[model samples]
Target: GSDAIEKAVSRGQCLYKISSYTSYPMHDFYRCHTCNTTDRNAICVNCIKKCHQGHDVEFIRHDRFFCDCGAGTLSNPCTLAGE
Candidate 1:
Protein backbone atom coordinates (compact mmCIF):
# COMPACT_ATOMS: atom_id res chain seq x y z
CA GLY A 1 0.00 0.00 0.00
CA SER A 2 2.06 2.85 1.30
CA ASP A 3 5.27 1.18 0.20
CA ALA A 4 3.99 0.98 -3.34
CA ILE A 5 3.11 4.65 -3.29
CA GLU A 6 6.51 5.56 -1.98
CA LYS A 7 8.18 3.55 -4.75
CA ALA A 8 6.00 5.22 -7.32
CA VAL A 9 6.86 8.64 -6.01
CA SER A 10 10.50 7.78 -6.09
CA ARG A 11 10.24 6.63 -9.66
CA GLY A 12 8.27 9.70 -10.71
CA GLN A 13 11.06 11.92 -9.49
CA CYS A 14 13.43 10.16 -11.88
CA LEU A 15 14.77 12.28 -14.69
CA TYR A 16 17.93 12.86 -16.67
CA LYS A 17 20.17 12.72 -13.64
CA ILE A 18 17.64 14.70 -11.62
CA SER A 19 17.34 11.69 -9.36
CA SER A 20 21.10 11.33 -9.26
CA TYR A 21 23.87 12.96 -7.27
CA THR A 22 27.60 13.37 -7.48
CA SER A 23 28.02 12.55 -3.79
CA TYR A 24 25.83 9.46 -3.88
CA PRO A 25 28.72 7.08 -4.30
CA MET A 26 30.16 8.34 -1.04
CA HIS A 27 27.18 8.07 1.30
CA ASP A 28 27.50 5.64 4.20
CA PHE A 29 24.75 4.54 6.52
CA TYR A 30 26.08 3.53 9.90
CA ARG A 31 25.12 1.83 13.13
CA CYS A 32 27.18 3.03 16.04
CA HIS A 33 30.96 2.81 15.54
CA THR A 34 31.17 -0.77 14.33
CA CYS A 35 28.56 -1.21 11.64
CA ASN A 36 28.03 0.49 8.32
CA THR A 37 26.04 0.20 5.11
CA THR A 38 26.34 1.85 1.72
CA ASP A 39 23.98 2.38 -1.17
CA ARG A 40 24.21 4.63 -4.15
CA ASN A 41 20.56 5.61 -4.45
CA ALA A 42 19.20 5.39 -0.94
CA ILE A 43 20.18 5.12 2.71
CA CYS A 44 21.07 1.63 3.95
CA VAL A 45 18.05 0.20 5.69
CA ASN A 46 20.00 -2.35 7.68
CA CYS A 47 22.21 0.31 9.20
CA ILE A 48 19.26 2.49 10.05
CA LYS A 49 17.45 -0.41 11.68
CA LYS A 50 20.43 -1.40 13.73
CA CYS A 51 20.89 2.13 15.01
CA HIS A 52 17.24 2.87 15.62
CA GLN A 53 16.11 -0.44 17.01
CA GLY A 54 13.15 -0.17 19.38
CA HIS A 55 13.06 3.57 18.77
CA ASP A 56 11.84 6.04 16.21
CA VAL A 57 14.22 6.56 13.34
CA GLU A 58 14.32 9.69 11.31
CA PHE A 59 16.19 10.30 8.05
CA ILE A 60 17.51 13.50 6.61
CA ARG A 61 19.54 14.10 3.45
CA HIS A 62 22.87 15.74 4.05
CA ASP A 63 25.66 15.66 1.52
CA ARG A 64 28.11 15.94 4.40
CA PHE A 65 26.84 12.98 6.42
CA PHE A 66 23.93 11.34 4.70
CA CYS A 67 22.37 11.08 1.23
CA ASP A 68 22.80 14.02 -1.12
CA CYS A 69 19.02 14.49 -0.86
CA GLY A 70 19.10 17.03 -3.64
CA ALA A 71 21.39 19.53 -1.98
CA GLY A 72 24.42 20.27 -4.15
CA THR A 73 26.97 20.41 -1.39
CA LEU A 74 30.60 20.20 -2.48
CA SER A 75 31.81 17.86 0.25
CA ASN A 76 31.53 14.08 0.23
CA PRO A 77 28.97 13.70 3.00
CA CYS A 78 29.59 10.06 3.82
CA THR A 79 33.28 9.89 4.56
CA LEU A 80 34.92 10.91 7.81
CA ALA A 81 38.20 11.58 6.05
CA GLY A 82 36.23 13.90 3.75
CA GLU A 83 37.50 12.03 0.72
Candidate 2:
Protein backbone atom coordinates (compact mmCIF):
# COMPACT_ATOMS: atom_id res chain seq x y z
CA GLY A 1 0.00 0.00 0.00
CA SER A 2 2.79 2.37 0.85
CA ASP A 3 4.51 1.61 -2.45
CA ALA A 4 1.44 2.48 -4.46
CA ILE A 5 0.76 5.53 -2.33
CA GLU A 6 4.34 6.66 -2.57
CA LYS A 7 4.33 6.30 -6.35
CA ALA A 8 1.16 8.30 -6.69
CA VAL A 9 2.39 11.01 -4.36
CA SER A 10 5.68 11.21 -6.19
CA ARG A 11 3.86 11.54 -9.46
CA GLY A 12 1.66 14.27 -8.10
CA GLN A 13 4.67 16.12 -6.74
CA CYS A 14 6.45 15.83 -10.07
CA LEU A 15 3.48 17.40 -11.83
CA TYR A 16 4.02 20.56 -9.77
CA LYS A 17 5.92 23.47 -11.30
CA ILE A 18 9.18 24.17 -9.55
CA SER A 19 10.49 27.22 -11.42
CA SER A 20 10.60 28.79 -14.82
CA TYR A 21 14.38 28.84 -15.05
CA THR A 22 15.55 26.05 -12.74
CA SER A 23 14.28 22.71 -11.45
CA TYR A 24 13.60 22.55 -7.73
CA PRO A 25 12.41 19.89 -5.32
CA MET A 26 8.77 20.66 -4.63
CA HIS A 27 7.85 17.92 -2.17
CA ASP A 28 10.67 18.38 0.22
CA PHE A 29 8.84 18.73 3.52
CA TYR A 30 7.64 15.68 5.39
CA ARG A 31 4.25 16.20 7.03
CA CYS A 32 2.89 14.50 10.10
CA HIS A 33 -0.42 12.82 9.37
CA THR A 34 -1.37 12.72 13.04
CA CYS A 35 -1.17 16.51 13.27
CA ASN A 36 -1.96 17.61 9.68
CA THR A 37 0.97 19.98 9.80
CA THR A 38 4.35 20.46 8.23
CA ASP A 39 7.70 21.84 9.39
CA ARG A 40 11.27 22.54 8.38
CA ASN A 41 12.17 18.89 8.03
CA ALA A 42 13.13 19.27 4.42
CA ILE A 43 16.38 20.44 2.93
CA CYS A 44 14.70 23.62 1.69
CA VAL A 45 11.92 24.84 3.96
CA ASN A 46 11.68 28.15 2.13
CA CYS A 47 10.87 26.49 -1.13
CA ILE A 48 8.43 24.06 0.47
CA LYS A 49 6.66 26.91 2.24
CA LYS A 50 6.28 28.77 -1.01
CA CYS A 51 4.77 25.79 -2.72
CA HIS A 52 2.44 25.04 0.17
CA GLN A 53 1.10 28.57 0.12
CA GLY A 54 0.84 28.81 -3.66
CA HIS A 55 -0.39 25.29 -4.31
CA ASP A 56 -2.87 23.17 -2.42
CA VAL A 57 -0.91 20.78 -0.30
CA GLU A 58 -2.03 17.23 -1.17
CA PHE A 59 -1.44 14.58 1.47
CA ILE A 60 -1.34 11.24 -0.28
CA ARG A 61 -1.39 8.14 1.88
CA HIS A 62 1.75 6.16 2.64
CA ASP A 63 3.50 4.49 5.54
CA ARG A 64 5.45 7.62 6.29
CA PHE A 65 2.59 10.12 5.93
CA PHE A 66 -0.59 8.10 6.12
CA CYS A 67 -3.69 9.72 7.60
CA ASP A 68 -7.45 9.80 7.25
CA CYS A 69 -7.68 13.56 7.10
CA GLY A 70 -10.46 13.63 4.52
CA ALA A 71 -13.20 11.41 3.21
CA GLY A 72 -13.24 9.75 -0.23
CA THR A 73 -10.26 8.47 -2.19
CA LEU A 74 -6.77 9.54 -1.26
CA SER A 75 -5.58 9.93 -4.85
CA ASN A 76 -8.67 11.75 -6.06
CA PRO A 77 -8.26 10.14 -9.44
CA CYS A 78 -11.50 11.48 -10.90
CA THR A 79 -10.87 15.12 -10.02
CA LEU A 80 -7.16 14.96 -10.71
CA ALA A 81 -7.43 17.01 -13.89
CA GLY A 82 -9.18 19.81 -12.06
CA GLU A 83 -6.65 19.56 -9.24
Candidate 3:
Protein backbone atom coordinates (compact mmCIF):
# COMPACT_ATOMS: atom_id res chain seq x y z
CA GLY A 1 0.00 0.00 0.00
CA SER A 2 0.90 3.69 -0.02
CA ASP A 3 1.52 3.66 3.78
CA ALA A 4 5.27 3.13 4.08
CA ILE A 5 5.55 4.97 0.81
CA GLU A 6 4.43 8.13 2.56
CA LYS A 7 7.14 7.81 5.18
CA ALA A 8 9.84 6.86 2.70
CA VAL A 9 9.75 10.23 1.01
CA SER A 10 12.90 11.34 2.78
CA ARG A 11 15.52 13.73 1.42
CA GLY A 12 17.23 11.10 -0.70
CA GLN A 13 14.10 9.88 -2.42
CA CYS A 14 13.21 11.11 -5.86
CA LEU A 15 10.10 11.11 -8.00
CA TYR A 16 9.87 10.99 -11.74
CA LYS A 17 6.89 11.39 -14.04
CA ILE A 18 5.53 8.97 -16.57
CA SER A 19 7.69 7.89 -19.44
CA SER A 20 7.90 9.28 -22.93
CA TYR A 21 5.12 9.60 -25.43
CA THR A 22 5.45 7.81 -28.81
CA SER A 23 6.91 5.09 -26.69
CA TYR A 24 4.88 1.86 -26.91
CA PRO A 25 1.98 4.16 -27.70
CA MET A 26 2.47 5.71 -24.27
CA HIS A 27 -0.33 7.09 -22.19
CA ASP A 28 -1.83 10.52 -22.61
CA PHE A 29 -4.07 11.84 -19.84
CA TYR A 30 -6.96 14.16 -19.14
CA ARG A 31 -8.74 15.46 -16.06
CA CYS A 32 -12.32 14.41 -15.85
CA HIS A 33 -14.64 17.17 -14.74
CA THR A 34 -17.63 15.03 -13.74
CA CYS A 35 -15.74 12.00 -12.53
CA ASN A 36 -12.60 11.03 -10.55
CA THR A 37 -14.62 9.30 -7.88
CA THR A 38 -11.62 7.36 -6.57
CA ASP A 39 -14.00 4.57 -7.42
CA ARG A 40 -11.65 2.01 -8.87
CA ASN A 41 -9.65 4.95 -10.18
CA ALA A 42 -12.04 4.42 -13.03
CA ILE A 43 -10.41 6.02 -15.99
CA CYS A 44 -7.59 5.63 -18.45
CA VAL A 45 -6.13 7.53 -21.37
CA ASN A 46 -7.93 5.17 -23.67
CA CYS A 47 -11.14 5.89 -21.83
CA ILE A 48 -10.55 9.57 -22.36
CA LYS A 49 -10.09 9.15 -26.06
CA LYS A 50 -13.09 6.96 -26.78
CA CYS A 51 -15.53 7.07 -23.91
CA HIS A 52 -15.35 10.71 -22.81
CA GLN A 53 -14.32 12.23 -26.08
CA GLY A 54 -15.46 15.84 -26.49
CA HIS A 55 -17.41 15.53 -23.27
CA ASP A 56 -16.19 17.33 -20.17
CA VAL A 57 -12.72 16.23 -21.19
CA GLU A 58 -9.79 18.50 -20.64
CA PHE A 59 -6.63 17.10 -22.19
CA ILE A 60 -4.32 18.25 -19.46
CA ARG A 61 -0.73 17.27 -19.96
CA HIS A 62 1.01 16.42 -16.72
CA ASP A 63 3.07 13.72 -15.15
CA ARG A 64 1.89 10.94 -12.86
CA PHE A 65 4.65 10.37 -10.39
CA PHE A 66 5.15 7.09 -8.60
CA CYS A 67 4.70 8.95 -5.31
CA ASP A 68 2.52 11.35 -3.49
CA CYS A 69 2.13 14.93 -4.61
CA GLY A 70 2.54 17.20 -1.66
CA ALA A 71 3.81 20.57 -0.55
CA GLY A 72 5.02 19.37 2.81
CA THR A 73 3.98 16.64 5.20
CA LEU A 74 0.50 15.14 5.20
CA SER A 75 -0.95 17.43 7.86
CA ASN A 76 0.30 20.58 6.15
CA PRO A 77 0.47 19.13 2.68
CA CYS A 78 -0.39 20.83 -0.56
CA THR A 79 0.00 20.05 -4.26
CA LEU A 80 3.08 18.21 -5.51
CA ALA A 81 4.29 21.18 -7.49
CA GLY A 82 3.95 23.31 -4.38
CA GLU A 83 6.44 24.06 -1.63
Candidate 4:
Protein backbone atom coordinates (compact mmCIF):
# COMPACT_ATOMS: atom_id res chain seq x y z
CA GLY A 1 0.00 0.00 0.00
CA SER A 2 1.03 3.59 -0.46
CA ASP A 3 1.65 4.21 3.21
CA ALA A 4 4.19 1.42 3.57
CA ILE A 5 5.48 1.79 0.05
CA GLU A 6 5.61 5.51 0.60
CA LYS A 7 7.65 4.93 3.73
CA ALA A 8 10.39 3.13 1.91
CA VAL A 9 12.83 4.28 -0.68
CA SER A 10 14.18 1.28 -2.54
CA ARG A 11 17.27 0.69 -4.59
CA GLY A 12 16.78 -2.86 -5.84
CA GLN A 13 16.64 -5.02 -2.67
CA CYS A 14 18.34 -2.33 -0.67
CA LEU A 15 15.74 -0.09 0.90
CA TYR A 16 15.44 2.68 3.43
CA LYS A 17 12.43 4.32 4.95
CA ILE A 18 11.92 8.04 4.90
CA SER A 19 9.70 7.45 7.88
CA SER A 20 12.60 5.86 9.73
CA TYR A 21 13.58 9.39 10.58
CA THR A 22 10.46 9.67 12.71
CA SER A 23 9.47 7.99 15.97
CA TYR A 24 5.84 7.38 15.09
CA PRO A 25 4.75 3.89 16.03
CA MET A 26 4.09 1.77 12.96
CA HIS A 27 1.67 -0.70 14.44
CA ASP A 28 -2.00 -1.02 15.11
CA PHE A 29 -2.92 1.70 12.67
CA TYR A 30 -6.55 1.69 11.59
CA ARG A 31 -9.17 2.74 9.03
CA CYS A 32 -12.93 2.95 8.91
CA HIS A 33 -14.70 1.14 6.14
CA THR A 34 -18.09 2.07 7.46
CA CYS A 35 -17.65 5.81 7.63
CA ASN A 36 -15.67 5.84 4.39
CA THR A 37 -13.60 8.99 4.58
CA THR A 38 -10.63 9.64 2.32
CA ASP A 39 -7.97 11.43 4.28
CA ARG A 40 -5.18 10.38 6.60
CA ASN A 41 -7.56 7.73 7.82
CA ALA A 42 -7.79 6.33 4.33
CA ILE A 43 -4.29 7.39 3.37
CA CYS A 44 -2.48 7.24 6.68
CA VAL A 45 -3.92 6.74 10.16
CA ASN A 46 -7.57 6.28 10.91
CA CYS A 47 -7.55 8.98 13.50
CA ILE A 48 -9.42 9.29 16.75
CA LYS A 49 -10.65 12.59 15.44
CA LYS A 50 -12.69 13.21 12.28
CA CYS A 51 -11.68 10.16 10.35
CA HIS A 52 -12.50 7.98 13.29
CA GLN A 53 -14.46 10.36 15.43
CA GLY A 54 -17.39 7.97 15.25
CA HIS A 55 -16.21 5.50 12.68
CA ASP A 56 -16.48 1.76 13.10
CA VAL A 57 -12.90 1.25 12.04
CA GLU A 58 -10.76 -1.84 12.09
CA PHE A 59 -7.13 -1.57 13.04
CA ILE A 60 -4.33 -2.92 10.95
CA ARG A 61 -0.79 -3.69 12.11
CA HIS A 62 1.39 -0.62 12.12
CA ASP A 63 3.89 -2.39 9.87
CA ARG A 64 0.96 -2.88 7.53
CA PHE A 65 0.44 0.82 7.24
CA PHE A 66 -1.75 0.64 4.19
CA CYS A 67 -5.33 1.60 3.85
CA ASP A 68 -7.78 -1.23 3.16
CA CYS A 69 -10.76 0.81 4.12
CA GLY A 70 -12.82 -0.38 1.17
CA ALA A 71 -11.03 -3.44 -0.04
CA GLY A 72 -13.97 -5.79 -0.43
CA THR A 73 -16.78 -3.32 -0.43
CA LEU A 74 -17.44 0.46 -0.14
CA SER A 75 -18.41 0.66 -3.84
CA ASN A 76 -14.84 1.91 -4.42
CA PRO A 77 -11.34 1.12 -3.26
CA CYS A 78 -9.63 3.24 -0.61
CA THR A 79 -7.81 5.14 -3.29
CA LEU A 80 -7.13 5.36 -7.00
CA ALA A 81 -3.84 3.62 -6.23
CA GLY A 82 -5.89 0.39 -5.83
CA GLU A 83 -5.55 -0.18 -2.13
lDDT of 2 by residue, 1-83 (tens): 22543354556532222322233323333332223333312212222233334444433322222121221112222122234
Q: What TM-score would you give candidate 3 relative to the actual structure?
A: 0.32
Clashing pairs in 1: 63-77, 64-77
For model 3, how does the per-residue alpha-carbon lDDT over 1-83 read when each residue is reduced to its tens digit?
Answer: 34332333332232212212222212234554544433222223444444445656565554342221121212222223333
Candidate 1 whole-model C-alpha lDDT, 0 to 1: 0.32
Estimate, for each residue in 17-63, the C-alpha lDDT of model 4 and write its tens digit. 22232334244555566655444443234232322446576654546
Write down the worst ten-residue block by lDDT for model 1: 74-83
Better of 1 and 4 by TM-score: 4
What is the clash count of model 4? 3
Candidate 2 minimal-lDDT segment of 10 residues: 64-73
Deviation in Å, model 4, residue 31 alpha carbon: 1.8
Error of 2 at 13 (Å): 6.4
CA displacement after TM-score superposition, residue 31 of candidate 2 (Å): 8.9
lDDT of 4 at 60: 48
Report the lDDT of model 1 for residue 32. Answer: 31
Q: Is 2 or 3 the stronger prediction by TM-score?
A: 3
Best of the candidates, lDDT: 4
lDDT of each: 0.32, 0.29, 0.33, 0.38
Candidate achieving higher lDDT, 1 or 4: 4
